[PDB]
Structures are given as C-alpha cells and as structure tokens.
Symmetry: C2
Subunit: 114 residues, 2 copies
C-alpha cells in the first residue's frame, strides 16, 4: 500500500476529488472504483446498498483498480452525467446508478483502464 | 356548477394552470384547494395520500365559496415562484418533503388569509 499511496495523492489532489461526489463533504475517505469517484463514510454505506455490479466501494488494491481511479473522477463523472438527455438532477441514488448514463461511464472507465 | 364553471375556467387561464403542477401533464382535471394548484388524475390520487391536513383535493366536475376563493389566491406558477424563493427550497423534494416543508405551510396560510 505504499507504492499505491503516492498515486491516490496525485488523483486526490485533482478535479474535485477532495469533496464527496454525492454530498460534497470534505476529504472523502472512500471511493467507488467503478466511476473513479471519491465518497464519504456515510455515502459509502449508501453505495453499498446499490450492488457491486453498479458500485464497487473501497477504502483508500489491484493495479486495474488504480487505473480505474486515474481513468474516472468526480468532476469528470458529473460533467459526463450532465450532458446525457435523460439526465435527471433529482434522481435517487438507485435511479442514478441504474441509469443508462451510469452504465455508459462504467463501460468508459473499464475501456480506458484497459 | 354554472357560477363555478365560469370562475374555474377564468382561473385555468392564469399562469401554468393548464399543466399538472407536479409532473407537467396536459389539462389537469383535479386541484388541491389548499394551494390553488391544478393536478392530473394520477397526482390527485397521490394528493389524497398525503392527508387532507396537507392537501384537500376536489374535481373540476365534482363546491364552496371558500374552496373557490382559494383557487383565485393560489395558482401553479404562483406556488412554484413562492417555493423557489424560500431559503430551504429543494427542487428535488419528494412529494412528502415538499408538502411537509415550511415553505408549503407558509403558502397554505397566504392562501387562507387571501381567501378570507
Ligand atoms: Zn457524502
Ligand atoms: Zn401529474
């Protein structure tokens, strides 16, 4: 976990990766590797109820998992979701992560990490 | 319903009363008297669910003087405008959060006071 600490710092110190993606709490301590997003203790609990096929929730490790972190990001995922036509800013967590948009970014994050 | 029909259609014409307050569907036949708002058949059933302390529902076809005065005092756009300008407004409120909000309370009372 040393070699890998350094990398997460690079990624954390980047695009809105130090606020929780869902609720904006500072210094998110958790991630959804799936979307390269950084979340807080509480929101990780909530993510854990979505299913691993929709969200893979870790605490700040496999190489391909770091590559997903480099590939995705808080700002990047939000920017992406905001341009989809059936985007709804009032989605529940469930609707959001079960949406076309989310699936597409997952696929994107995998394709890039590979 | 002849006096009614007239005034009711006079009110339909006022801002945004031709679409459902909640979901936006065309030509809502139902109302929540509590807010002067117009709502579709489906959403009317939804409003019966909140409880008559949060939403009193009636039909365009189903009226009292006061019930009618409340329609004049509220309105879909008026209520939305009011809501958007309260400090705690959340446009992603669920139906229960919305109608249990302070903003909803305050608009109920604007409507009652204007009515009488
Ligand atoms: Zn959070
Ligand atoms: Zn409706």
């Amino acid at each position: 976990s040393p070699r890998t600490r350094k990398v997460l710092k690079e990624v954390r110190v980047q695009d809105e990766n130090n606020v929780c993606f869902e609720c904006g709490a500072f210094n998110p301590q958790w991630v959804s590797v799936t979307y390269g997003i950084w979340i807080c203790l509480e929101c990780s609990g909530r993510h854990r109820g979505l299913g691993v096929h929709l969200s893979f929730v870790r605490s700040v490790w496999k190489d391909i998992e770091l590559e997903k972190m480099k590939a995705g990001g808080n700002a990047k995922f939000r920017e992406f979701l905001e341009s989809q036509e059936d985007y709804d800013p009032c989605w529940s967590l469930q609707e959001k992560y079960n949406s076309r948009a989310a699936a597409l970014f997952r696929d994107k994050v995998v394709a890039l990490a590979e």
